[PDB]
A paper describes a structure:
Cytochromes c′ occur in methanotrophic, denitrifying and photosynthetic bacteria and have proposed roles in protection against nitrosative stress, NO trafficking during denitrification or pathogen defence. All cytochromes c′ have a 4 α-helix bundle structure containing a heme centre with a solvent exposed proximal His ligand and a buried hydrophobic distal pocket with a non-coordinated residue (Leu or Phe, rarely Met or Tyr) in a position to exert steric influence on the binding of diatomic gases. Unusually, cytochromes c′ are able to utilize both heme faces (distal and proximal) as a means of discriminating NO from other diatomic gases. In order to understand the factors controlling distal versus proximal NO coordination, we have examined NO binding to AXCP variants in which the occluding distal residue Leu16 is replaced with residues that are smaller (Ala, Val), of comparable size (Ile) or larger (Phe).
Residue numbers in the entry:
A (entry chain A), B (entry chain A): 1 to 126
The structure:
Amino acid sequence: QFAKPEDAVKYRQSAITLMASHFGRMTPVVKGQAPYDAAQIKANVEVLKTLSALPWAAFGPGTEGGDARPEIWSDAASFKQKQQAFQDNIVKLSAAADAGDLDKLRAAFGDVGASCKACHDAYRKK
Amino acid sequence: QFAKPEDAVKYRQSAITLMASHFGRMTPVVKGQAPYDAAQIKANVEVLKTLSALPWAAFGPGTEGGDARPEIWSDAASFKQKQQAFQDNIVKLSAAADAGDLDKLRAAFGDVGASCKACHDAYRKK
Ligand code: HEC
Ligand code: HEC
């Protein structure tokens, strides 16, 4: 859907900004510093679920740029494993949110965060 | 969810980038230049439906900036009407996509686009 590779970069960076905000805005809730409203979090995690699928389609062939390492492309199956682990952990976060349990939410949240970092460590430029 | 007003600006601009891409990427389909796959469009419009709700929460009090005119805040009920007309036209686009009819899709698409422009004409800086 991108006229030029720059447009894929812009898209993925914007998708990531959104995803990161819908993830990170729950940090005070999982830490107990903000109240836990099960319906509020369930709705937010449904947004996050949609957003979490969007970046990966904007690393198509030819869309090198931004802070993406070239190894994303050179090792496409390996990158896909990092993406899949992350998406599987989002499924578990959805489950915890749907169950309305803060202890399960905080565990699932931490698993997602670990998956974010693992992909960055391999595939995001310093 | 924003630490500083700048963060709301960044969020809304990213939300808009996404929304615009999921809207605009259908232009070749509504024009007939790309094939019409009803399932593909139904899925894309479901993404668009989620995205189309996101910008408006990031024009909260105190988040003046970017290319937002100050009248967004000064005339909050009026801005809300432009936002609601747009969101109602998204509901109609979802209906057309769910119905699998390209003639209804192209009409609903044009209605959404008109709603985008109407809000810009009043509330987006030149
Ligand atoms: C690989 C499978 C990744 C996973 C999982 C996550 N991120 Fe990511 N991130 C990745 C790349 C390759 C890049 C660079 C994209 C580019 O072209 O520039 C990024 C970048 C970020 C950024 C920078 C800001 C931005 O681009 O808007 C942030 C803040 C970021 N990533 C956050 C983030 C979070 C919170 C994640 C899990 C919820 C996450 N990323 C997962 C690769 C991958
Ligand atoms: C008001 C109810 C709006 C509707 C409906 C749409 N847009 Fe919008 N748009 C609006 C404002 C106030 C702004 C400026 C935001 C800021 O703080 O800078 C914008 C901006 C854009 C942009 C610029 C790029 C960006 O911010 O990423 C684009 C490309 C854009 N808008 C597109 C767009 C489309 C395609 C719309 C309907 C599908 C649409 N906008 C609706 C206000 C409003």
